[PDB]
């Protein structure tokens, strides 16, 4: 009793959109992101921290799956500006364990067991004041992801318009959290302020989200997840899809041009985040098959 | 030509109100602070800005405080100490907003904010309120002709409203106001800033319309009506209708939140309109209560 297969996939458009994304970055960012190459002992300080954090929750996560989560941090920070490798490791761990939370059936969502682990992490890696800002944002993200599961507010914000949708994603895609745990990496006063006002997150939300949405569309509709801007257009209609996609390209371009008004080091961090997320997204098994050993729901 | 939106004052006021009556319906209710409450607030404001060395009159404090009196959600208030705190913090950062930036001494003012926050709030909420107040005044200061403010207020309504989530003080407002209500959902939306992101356009479009003449006279660029041609009534009308449509869109989406939270959001937007149209600050450009503080 067939449903709407023609709306089930953006796979027809995969090559052309990938090409167009890359052309856009080449014309407006130019500088290619840089990957951090951790060592193995060093990677096992991150991963055993990740396993320790989610271990109380009772679900095993493979090293392969951790790898899929951690790549976004390796590719989308600004390695040239790092001064707190402890803060960098915190962001690797915090990113990864909240990625697990994102992928979990909400039955496993135990704040009483998981929150204490998040405080544990922020304390090993951050000075006591930055540990406070990182913990607040991690708490706020995991609480948001959880209460908004099948939520009326999410329904309305994901159906009305792109600008309502992106307003939801400032928090839900995790970028506000990202900024508020990453500023200790850089010890840059201006970026720290843009991080704490959330202006940093507001400038980078669309560039992160549009890319994530395109490449996670197939998995998300097969699972009934509504948080994806391409559900706002008719992806079965090539003409309509193209107009929508160009509108989203225009969004990214305008944000990138305004990020250029920020000071030199802040804009490097912002642009490495957006462009690094795109390199990571296109290179990661997470977004290559619909359902896999690193991206299928962790069900309970 | 582009100097003024005076010609459209009556029509735009009419249209704002019609929009609220059809979409919000329920009218703001003013808080009637008692005397002991009101005198405490003003004395507190004067103590806070005294280290900056400038006089603020009672009628200037009253004009600032009216937004809190009109734009909270009285029938849901639980903690009047938190309400008094929002009165004081709102007012003293309004003074900061009106201060030409040589006066901004963080080492003298930040301790004042900290002590206000600790007096009226518990230990956890005092930290959230203080960080939000600190972020606001720092942002107002660091963006006085910054290039970032340049790009974000010139490019599109998009970048502009993104700047105003912080710069119009609404993120700060939410983070100091959630203790008033003790409503866990509202507290989450406040701390994620989703509450601020939902209410920014409604507050800003109204504020920008009625503060345009003052801001343009005094070389101030943070105003969405500067994005469009107020020379041409037809272009102004198109732009003003696009802004009304934005407000409507936000209000209709706000009616997805839980009943109480949506009450607070909508009383904030509608109450700001009522206060703005009754406040001398938002008539003319130079007067008793909106003059730069120098
Ligand atoms: C805590 C991390 C950082 C959180 C974890 C879940 C998140 C919502 C997953 C998804 F949205 C990722 C790949 C997009 C990458 C963007 C970063 C800024 C934020 C990404 C999110
Ligand atoms: C925030 C909202 C409700 C309203 C609406 C815009 C406002 C009129 C402008 C301005 F004064 C702000 C930045 C400075 C003081 C901050 C807030 C708390 C209150 C101040 C005002
Ligand atoms: Cl610290
Ligand atoms: Cl925000
Ligand atoms: Cl408290
Ligand atoms: K666009
Ligand atoms: K519009
Ligand atoms: Mg998610
Ligand atoms: Mg997800
Ligand atoms: Mg996705
Ligand atoms: Mg169809
Ligand atoms: Mg201002
Ligand atoms: Mg002002
Ligand atoms: Mg206290
Ligand atoms: Mg104004
Ligand atoms: Mg007067």
UniProtKB/Swiss-Prot annotation, chain B:
Keywords: Isomerase, Lyase, Magnesium, Metal-binding. Its cofactor is Mg(2+). Mg(2+) 3 binds at residues 207, 211, 215. InterPro entries: Isoprenoid_synthase_dom_sf. Binds 3 Mg(2+) ions per subunit. The keyword Metal-binding applies. It is an enzyme of class 4 (lyase). A motif (DDXXD motif) lies at residues 97-100. Mg(2+) 1 binds at residue 97. Changing residue 98 to E: Abolishes activity, no product. Pfam families: Terpene_syn_C_2. Mg(2+) 2 binds at residue 97. The keyword RNA-binding does not apply. Its EC number is 4.2.3.146. Changing residue 136 to Y: Abolishes activity, no product. A motif (NSE/DTE motif) lies at residues 207-215. It catalyses: geranylgeranyl diphosphate + H2O = cyclooctat-9-en-7-ol + diphosphate. Belongs to the terpene synthase family. Homodimer. 3,7,18-dolabellatriene produced by the Trp288Gly mutant has potential antibiotic activity against multidrug-resistant S.aureus (MRSA). The Asp-Asp-Xaa-Xaa-Asp/Glu(DDXXD/E) motifs is important for the catalytic activity, presumably through binding to Mg(2+). This is Cyclooctat-9-en-7-ol synthase. The lineage of its organism: Bacteria, Bacillati, Actinomycetota, Actinomycetes, Kitasatosporales. The gene is CotB2.
């Amino acid at each position: 009793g067939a449903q709407d297969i023609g709306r089930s996939s953006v796979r027809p458009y995969l090559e052309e959109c990938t090409r167009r994304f890359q052309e856009m970055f080449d014309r407006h960012v130019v500088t290619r992101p840089t990957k951090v190459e951790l060592t193995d002992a060093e990677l096992r300080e991150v991963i055993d921290d990740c396993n320790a954090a989610v271990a109380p929750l009772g679900k095993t996560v493979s090293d392969e799956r951790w790898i899929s989560y951690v790549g976004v941090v390796l590719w989308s920070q600004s390695p040239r500006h790092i001064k707190d490798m402890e803060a960098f490791k915190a962001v690797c761990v915090l990113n990864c364990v909240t990625f697990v939370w994102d992928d979990m059936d909400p039955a496993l969502h135990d704040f009483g067991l998981f929150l204490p682990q998040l405080r544990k992490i922020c304390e090993k890696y951050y000075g006591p004041e930055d540990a406070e800002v990182a913990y607040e944002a991690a708490r706020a993200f995991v609480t948001s992801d959880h209460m908004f599961r099948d939520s009326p507010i999410k329904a309305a914000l994901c159906t009305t318009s792109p600008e309502q949708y992106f307003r939801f994603r400032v928090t839900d895609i995790g970028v506000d959290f990202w900024m508020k745990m990453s500023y200790p990496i850089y010890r840059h006063p201006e970026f720290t302020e843009h991080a704490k006002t959330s202006l940093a997150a507001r400038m980078t939300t669309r560039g992160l989200t549009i890319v994530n949405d395109f490449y996670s569309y197939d998995r998300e509709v097969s699972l009934g997840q509504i948080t994806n801007c391409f559900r706002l257009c008719d992806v079965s209609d090539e003409t309509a899809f193209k107009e929508f996609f160009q509108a989203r390209l225009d969004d990214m371009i305008e944000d990138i041009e305004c990020i250029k008004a920020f000071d030199q080091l802040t804009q490097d961090v912002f642009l490495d985040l957006i462009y690094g997320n795109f390199v990571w997204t296109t290179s990661n098994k997470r977004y290559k098959t619909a359902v896999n050993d690193v991206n299928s729901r962790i069900q309970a």
